[PDB]
């Protein structure tokens, strides 16, 4: 296993070429989220197009905070959502052709990786306990 990560800069009064305001950023963010875009995708879209560095350093607060602050928050965290729907897609594929024991092994690993952050999220209680795999 190796490293593949972004290295956010030492600057935090970013970025001094930013002509744009700090309210149109929040406007674009709520536009994209009520268009139905996950936090990662709204971040990358306004990173590329309406070029921000990151909204946590242009606005004073991260985008999950401003999504909750504008009443648009998710009901499950993004990672658990993506990993759940990956689990249901691999389950649908194995249900279609049940001989794929490699998909069985991968499904065991995917469900274990579900249970990891599931019990993490129960211990921190972002989504409430009694919760076990929808």
């Amino acid at each position: 296993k190796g490293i593949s990560s972004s290295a956010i800069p030492y600057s935090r009064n970013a970025p001094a070429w930013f002509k744009l305001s700090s309210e149109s950023v929040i406007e674009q963010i709520v536009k994209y989220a009520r268009k139905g875009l996950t936090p990662s995708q709204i971040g990358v879209l306004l990173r590329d197009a309406h070029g921000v560095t990151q909204a946590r350093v242009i606005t004073g607060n991260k985008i999950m905070r401003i999504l909750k602050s504008n009443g648009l928050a998710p009901e499950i965290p993004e990672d658990l959502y993506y990993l759940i729907k990956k689990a249901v897609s691999v389950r649908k594929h194995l249900e279609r052709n049940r001989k794929d024991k490699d998909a069985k092994f991968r499904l065991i690993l995917i469900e274990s990786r579900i249970h990891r952050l599931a019990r993490y999220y129960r211990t921190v209680a972002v989504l409430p306990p009694n919760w076990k795999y929808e």
Binding site: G36, E75, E78
Partner: peptide, 22 residues
């Protein structure tokens, strides 16, 4: 393109309206 038909609480509002109207 990569919009979602899930994942948001206003989307659980629209789908509870769905699951009570149907």
């Amino acid at each position: 393109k990569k919009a979602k038909k899930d994942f948001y609480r206003f989307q659980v509002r629209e789908r509870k309206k769905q699951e009570i109207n149907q």
